Amino acid sequence: NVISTLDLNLLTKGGGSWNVDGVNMKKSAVTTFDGKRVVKAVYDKNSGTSANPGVGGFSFSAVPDGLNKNAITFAWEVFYPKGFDFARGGKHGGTFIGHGAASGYQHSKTGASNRIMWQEKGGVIDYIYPPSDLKQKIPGLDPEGHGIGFFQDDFKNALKYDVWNRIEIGTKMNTFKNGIPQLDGESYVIVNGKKEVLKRINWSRSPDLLISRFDWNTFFGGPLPSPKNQVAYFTNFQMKKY
C-alpha cells in the first residue's frame, strides 16, 4: 500500500516526486546509520519551541505527487538509542488540511492538522488542531488553546529503544451533503503494528478545503524542552494508501 517513498538524498534539493520545500535542517543531517539512509535528528539540551533557546529537530513540507486529497497516510521509522530521554512529549509531523494556521496555539477557520506526538516514556498520541468555528461532536475537540490529544491510554511506552519503530498516521476527510460537513472524517495512528482509529471528525468546513500537505517538524514539547543533548534517527518516509 506504499504509493511512494521519500529519497532523503533529495531532501534539500526538492524531494523528487515528493515536492519538498520549507526545509530547515537546523543541526540535523542526512547520513547513514545501521546501514540505512537516515536523518540524524539533533536535539540540543533546552531545545523545543521558539520559547526554548537550544536548536533541535528539523522540518520540511511535502506535497507529493499522488497525494490523495480525500484520504492519505504518511509513515516513517524512528530509532531511539538506549538512554534517550523522551521528557513530557514532542512532535514528529503529520497532515495539514486546507490553508491557514493549525498549530502553535493558532487555529484558523480554513485549516486543520493531524499529527503524531511522542509522550513521556515513549508513549504516542494523535494530536489534532480542528478548525475554528466548526461544529464537532467528539468530546473535547475544541479549537481553543493547543491541540487535542487522542489515544493516550493506547500507546503507552510504545516507542522502544535500539530498534526501528514504525509509525503511521492516516487522515480521511469528512463528506459533505449540500455543502454541509457530515461529521464522518477519520484519523488513525499505527505504532509497531497496533492501530487505533478515531471517527466522526469534521476536518473542514467546505468541500474545497481538503488534505493539502505533509508537514514534518520534530521538536520537544511544548512546554518542556529536551533535558539533554541527544539524537534520534528517522528513515523510510512513506506516503501510503488510507
Ligand X SMILES: O=C(O)[C@H]1O[C@@H](O)[C@H](O)[C@@H](O)[C@@H]1O
Can you say which residues are annotated as belonging to the binding site for beta-D-glucuronate? 91, 104-105, 115, 119, 127, 129, 149, 152, 222
Nearest to 150, CA basis, from 171, 174, 176:
171
Minimal distance, residue 7 CB to ligand X, in Å: 32
Q: Give CA–CA dist 127/147, Å, rounded.
A: 6
Residues near ligand X, by CB under 6 A: 88-89, 117, 119, 125, 146, 148-149, 152
CB-nearest residue to ligand X: 149
Nearer to ligand X by Cβ, of 117 and 210: the residue is 117
Q: For every residue of 129-188, which 3-state class applies, written as one string?
A: ECCCCCCCCCCCCCCCCCCEEECCCCCCCCCCECCEEEEEEEEECCCEECCEECCCEEEE
Minimal distance, residue 221 CB to ligand X, in Å: 8
Report the binding-site residues.
91, 104-105, 115, 119, 127, 129, 149, 152, 222
Minimal distance, residue 152 CB to ligand X, in Å: 5
Nearer to ligand X by Cβ, of 217 and 238: the residue is 217
Q: How far apart are the first and last CA of the chain?
A: 8
Give CA angle at 150 (146, 156), nearest 5°: 115
The DSSP secondary-structure symbol of 9 reads G
Q: Give CA–CA dist 68/214, Å, rounded.
A: 11
Minimal distance, residue 206 CB to ligand X, in Å: 27
Nearer to ligand X by Cβ, of 109 and 146: the residue is 146
Minimal distance, residue 218 CB to ligand X, in Å: 14
Nearer to ligand X by Cβ, of 28 and 119: the residue is 119
Nearer to ligand X by Cβ, of 64 and 222: the residue is 222
User: C-alpha 38: how far from its chain's center?
Assistant: 17
DSSP alpha helices (H): ranges in the chain? Answer: none
